[PDB]
Design a protein around this ligand. Structure first.
Ligand SMILES: [Zn+2]
Length: 266
DNA sequence: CTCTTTTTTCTCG
DNA sequence: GAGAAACAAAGAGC
């Protein structure tokens, strides 16, 4: 999940579990609770879910008066709302049981994480992670973005993936954004001119907001439509919609990287 | 059979 | 920065 997929999950959870009292919590893989499973079970059992927020790719359950459960889905994490009698599935790891159903977390690769912290610890938690601004016109200041790009020799794709210039891009939307902005993923950032940086800035906001509107690319969130709008990601060998050149795939800083060699000049 | 492929954060040099 | 670890599964190829 990237930011649009996490936001989609957030919205669905907000609609359905806000106001629910947690009756019990069970784990078959307690080790994914980085702050300690038995501790979380003791603290949250009997508390009511008050809200669900998001920061970058992180989900934040607001529970009780002053608890915040920070959940990261990493590569394959999936939530679903199931009946209390639902059968166990192979990669289900945790469940919060309510009176009329349960929220189950599954993750084939076991990468996803849960951390229980307090309300006043949330802002420091994200400062420590060095997460950059949300991708909105209000929060994503082009001027600082420009200054950071000017002073780095990092390649644009991996720098964007750091979450530090702006929060929320993963492999799919970084590839999509760079195609939209006509920038090659290996471009050193200090080579980008002002007009390119402006187009990149706006393209990041536009692509992510579009993906949110379309419910993400493809349990909660599994109804997305953004996948039908992808121009390069996973489109190796197909033709660029703009110029007709074949989309190419290369490896950049360890990641599969899809681009048009005409539209995105090296 | 081996090798490659698919978010974050570490070690290494 | 480069490479790989955390982990599981699927596909290609010998
Ligand atoms: Zn093109």
């Amino acid at each position: 999940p990237e930011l649009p997929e996490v936001e989609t999950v957030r919205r669905e959870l907000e609609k359905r579990i806000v106001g629910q009292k947690i009756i019990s919590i069970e784990a078959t893989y307690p080790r994914m609770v980085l702050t300690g499973f038995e501790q979380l079970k003791k603290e949250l059992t009997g508390k009511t879910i008050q809200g669900i927020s998001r920061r970058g790719k992180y989900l934040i359950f607001e529970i009780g008066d002053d608890f915040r459960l920070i959940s990261h889905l990493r590569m394959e994490g999936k939530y679903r709302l199931a009946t209390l009698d639902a059968p166990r599935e192979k990669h289900d790891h945790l469940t919060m049981k309510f009176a009329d159903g349960q929220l189950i977390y599954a993750d084939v690769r076991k990468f996803g994480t849960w951390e229980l912290i307090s309300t006043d610890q949330v802002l420091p938690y994200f400062l420590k992670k060095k997460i950059g601004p949300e991708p909105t016109y209000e929060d994503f200041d082009e001027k600082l973005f420009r200054e950071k790009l000017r002073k780095s020799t990092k390649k644009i794709k991996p720098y964007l993936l750091e979450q530090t210039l702006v929060a929320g891009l993963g492999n799919i939307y970084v590839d999509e954004v760079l195609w939209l902005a006509k920038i090659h993923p290996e471009k050193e950032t200090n080579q980008l001119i002002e007009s390119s940086i402006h187009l990149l800035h706006d393209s990041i906001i536009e692509i992510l907001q579009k993906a949110i509107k379309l419910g993400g690319s493809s349990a909660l969130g599994s109804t997305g439509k953004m996948q039908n709008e992808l121009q390069v990601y996973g489109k190796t060998g197909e033709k660029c919609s703009r110029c007709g050149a074949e989309i190419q795939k290369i490896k950049v800083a360890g990641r599969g990287t899809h681009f048009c060699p005409v539209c995105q000049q090296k």
